[PDB]
Design a protein around this ligand. Structure first.
Ligand SMILES: [Zn+2]
Lengths: 95, 242, 125, 107, 124
RNA sequence: ACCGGCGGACGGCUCAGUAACACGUCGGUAACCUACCCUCGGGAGGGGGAUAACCCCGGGAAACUGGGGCUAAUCCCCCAUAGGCCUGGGGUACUGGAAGGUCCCCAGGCCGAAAGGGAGCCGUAAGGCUCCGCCCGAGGAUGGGCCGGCGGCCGAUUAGGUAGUUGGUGGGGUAACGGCCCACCAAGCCGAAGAUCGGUACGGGCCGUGAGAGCGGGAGCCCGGAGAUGGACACUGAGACACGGGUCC
């Protein structure tokens, strides 16, 4: 699986950066959220504890899976802004 | 069956001047009463979320707004139902972005970037003039705002004139009169978003509105309503309207 | 109550069947038969939209003006004539068209005591 | 004087408070031309206007009449068959919502 | 006609109940609301009951009462009769809304054998 | 939990009634109301009063509810001023196509405000700043009321209908004009170009069909109108005579 970043936006009204990317993975299943987040943090040199993956969407009959994620400057702002369900899904919140 | 004011607004019945998907959802933000009409206005939530994309959900849009990070004219607005209309300056001091709200050629409202120096000027068309207690003259503008002057300056202002007003301090910069050759910009009608210079003014009996002829930069002549004609300069536009 | 809505008959002469119930906004109120008395009697009525009306039921004084803006507060003795009704004059009922007698002379009323709360009149020279 | 119409004001004055020329009545809205059909009621006149209505299916016109009752100020004493101009005003009665403002030509 | 008398002392904010069966029931019967009755008229102790030293001139003031079927006695309805009336405030009605008017059941000033409780205030 | 503020008159459901200014469209309100929100010019001075919760005693089968003590407020009341409304005599400064409108000066009267309250940071104190607040005036905006011209179904085995009915003179009432209502004057008003009466039906954007002209439908989605078992009434509120508030048959 190869990750290619299609768009980076710097939102500072909310202290975050929005990342739109794609995963090229022919002949393989949809990558797990853990693996996607790990590779994204490794490539972008981000903080693992202040980044979330909004979604990883696999299309029909395609080897490209689209992906949307965010990276926050501060964990406090991350918790304040992001919903609880997405944090639970990403595993940041033990719940 | 109807007993009082409405509090909801379906997306399929939203004003045609908005840039909104009319079938993605069922409910739209009902604009709160404010400066401009509902036809030439849009709730600030849609500007924060859809137009600029700073937010993905109404909740975080409200969270952004409550911190006073969005400025309209020169005042910080926190109500997400606040209407913003034509010839309004939306400023985001944290980003340095300044936009002017103007209608495009199809009558829809769009944000045109402007400069920091321009961000402190808001033209106002004198919609009406009357008298108040103490023998003072009150001018009512196109956006519902009001100003007061002494009887000494009675003749300095007339209906359909334009006033350049610094904001949010509300100081009078200058007065642009409405005569022949005055640069104007059409804000409504079939000729919306078209600019030119005044040529002639025609009046009719009864309450039928007066009609003004305008000449565009290409020399073509068209017509519109005298109230639709918005003065923006004497010979050239004092503000950017592309 | 006193409904003040649409008539039940077409101008041609036919009848009209109501398609809806009476609405609270189309209701009136009983006439305020302002009478001459020894003291002024008035009441306050809350009207549509929270507005206020001052209703005069018994009137004792009157503000009389004489062709020059000068005004005097005088006493009402009797109603000489009230063209609005053939019995208002007999019963001492004050309305906008009444002609009253005061110590200064005859005065024609110019206000609406049922809607104003006061009685104003102009002297007859 | 003028009340927004490009017509000559009546040559005489009247004390009627419902006359737009010499009273407090205000004219606003539609202006129509018509022929007076009846003037029996006091200070009242019925105005008849004649117009054609087009039928799409039969691609032909039919004749229709519009009847309107208008106030008749004493100065403008319109009679039967006169050509008159009427202007919309506030409701003056149950069926009177127009006022005669001029007489275009006597019968 | 057994009356439960609730005597309340305004000088201390304490109320106590007693039960009277007959004989002295007639003396209370027939009196309206707003008239005092001397304590000794039908007194039962009243001294060690409250543990005080009420003066000999102590009087009982008829404040209110309640019928057998939980029906309060309005201090305004005339006569010993039960009637259904439309109330907006006052005894026997608890609005619970802004301008609600609910029709309730109340009695009149005069006590009757049907009355089960008489509430009285001590007057010095 | 209680007082208190706001909301609960929107949203949701149905097509009974309605042939009507109910609906569609174009215009008027110079004849009118508007809680929430926006702008401008001002003000927040002095007093008083209970009562909920709570405590004592209860009843009623329940639904509900009585007496006594005690208290607070952005709760309620009063005084002052500012301010509103009418009328009369004057000046013509304003918007308007045109002033029974607005503005300025005198005169007689009626009505008649507020919470300098709350939170945070400071400051020895005093005092300061920020946030959300209260009241009056003039406009806006939102949501309405009312009115006018035009347009859209069948029956002649339904031919005369109307009598507050048509119009006026003067008033009452309404937030507002109006026979909406009242008193007095006349006989007017509608009708074979189909009044009245009877049948059917929520009106429109639209949907079905046909080469088209046209014919038929107009439940689901949107706008508008009505209803809350059938009727008739009222209280609070800006907004109701109110589907999950009230009274009677
Ligand atoms: Zn005249």
């Amino acid at each position: 699986m190869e990750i290619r970043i299609k768009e980076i936006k710097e939102n500072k009204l909310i202290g975050r950066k929005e990342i739109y990317f794609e995963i090229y993975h022919p002949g393989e299943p949809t990558p797990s959220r853990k693996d996607v987040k790990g590779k994204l943090v490794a490539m972008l040199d981000l903080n693992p504890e202040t980044t979330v993956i909004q979604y990883i969407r696999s299309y029909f009959g395609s080897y490209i899976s689209k992906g949307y994620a965010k990276a926050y400057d501060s964990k406090e702002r991350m918790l304040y802004i992001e919903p609880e369900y997405i944090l639970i899904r990403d595993g940041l919140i033990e719940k | 069956a109807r007993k009082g004011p409405k509090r909801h607004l379906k997306r399929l019945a939203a004003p045609t001047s908005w840039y909104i998907e009319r079938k993605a959802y069922k409910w739209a933000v009902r604009p709160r009463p404010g400066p401009h009409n509902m036809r030439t206005s849009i709730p600030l939530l849609y500007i924060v979320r859809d137009y600029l994309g700073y937010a993905k959900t109404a909740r975080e849009a409200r969270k952004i707004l409550n911190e006073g990070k969005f400025l309209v004219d020169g005042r910080v607005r926190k109500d997400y139902k606040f209407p913003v209309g034509i010839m309004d300056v939306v400023s985001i001091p944290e980003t340095g972005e300044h936009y002017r709200v103007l209608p495009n050629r199809i009558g829809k409202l769009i944000l045109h970037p402007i400069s920091e120096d321009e961000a402190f000027i808001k033209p106002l068309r004198i919609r009406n003039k009357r008298m108040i207690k103490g023998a003072r003259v009150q001018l009512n503008f196109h956006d519902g705002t009001n100003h007061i002057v002494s009887i000494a300056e009675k003749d300095n202002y007339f209906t359909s004139y334009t006033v350049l007003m610094k904001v949010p301090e509300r100081e009078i910069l200058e007065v642009l009169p409405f005569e022949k050759g005055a640069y104007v910009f059409v804000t409504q009608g079939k000729n919306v978003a078209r600019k030119g210079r005044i040529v002639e003014i025609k009046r009719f009996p009864m309450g039928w509105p007066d009609v003004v002829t305008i000449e565009d930069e290409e020399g073509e002549l068209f017509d519109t309503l005298k109230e639709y004609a918005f003065v923006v300069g004497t010979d050239k536009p004092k503000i950017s309207l592309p | 109550a006193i409904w003040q809505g649409r008539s039940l008959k077409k101008p041609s002469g036919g009848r009209i069947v109501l398609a809806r119930k009476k609405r609270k906004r189309e209701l009136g109120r009983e006439p305020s038969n302002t009478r001459v008395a020894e003291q002024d009697k008035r009441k306050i009525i809350r009207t549509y939209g929270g507005n206020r009306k001052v209703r005069l039921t018994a009137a004792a004084y009157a503000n009389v003006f004489d062709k020059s803006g000068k005004g005097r507060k005088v006493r009402i003795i009797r109603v000489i004539e009230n063209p609005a009704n053939r019995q208002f004059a007999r019963r001492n009922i004050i309305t906008k068209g009444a002609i009253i007698e005061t110590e200064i002379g005859k005065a024609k009323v110019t206000s609406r005591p049922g809607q104003d709360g006061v009685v104003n009149a102009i002297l007859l020279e | 004087r003028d009340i927004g119409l490009r017509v000559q004001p009546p040559a005489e004055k009247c004390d009627d408070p419902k006359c737009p020329w010499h009273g407090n009545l205000k004219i606003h809205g539609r202006v129509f031309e018509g022929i007076v059909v009846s003037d029996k009621p006091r200070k009242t006149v019925t105005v008849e206007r004649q117009y054609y209505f087009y039928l799409n299916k039969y691609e032909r016109y039919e004749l229709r009449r519009s009847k309107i009752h208008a106030h008749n100020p004493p100065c403008i004493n319109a009679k039967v068959g006169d050509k008159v101009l009427i202007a919309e005003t506030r409701p003056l009665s149950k069926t009177k919502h127009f006022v005669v403002v001029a007489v275009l030509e006597r019968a | 006609a057994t009356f439960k008398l609730v005597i309340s002392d305004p000088k201390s904010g304490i109320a106590k109940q007693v039960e009277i069966t007959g004989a002295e029931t007639e003396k209370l019967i027939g009196k309206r609301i707003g008239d005092q009755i001397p304590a000794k008229e039908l007194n039962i102790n009243l001294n060690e009951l409250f543990g005080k030293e009420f003066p000999e001139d102590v009087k009982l003031e008829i404040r209110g009462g309640t019928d057998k079927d939980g029906f309060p006695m309005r201090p305004d309805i005339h006569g010993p009769r039960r009637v259904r009336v439309l109330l907006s405030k006052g005894p026997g009605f608890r609005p619970k809304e802004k301008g609600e008017r609910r029709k309730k059941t109340v009695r009149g000033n005069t006590i009757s054998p049907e009355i089960v409780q008489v509430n009285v205030k001590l007057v010095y």
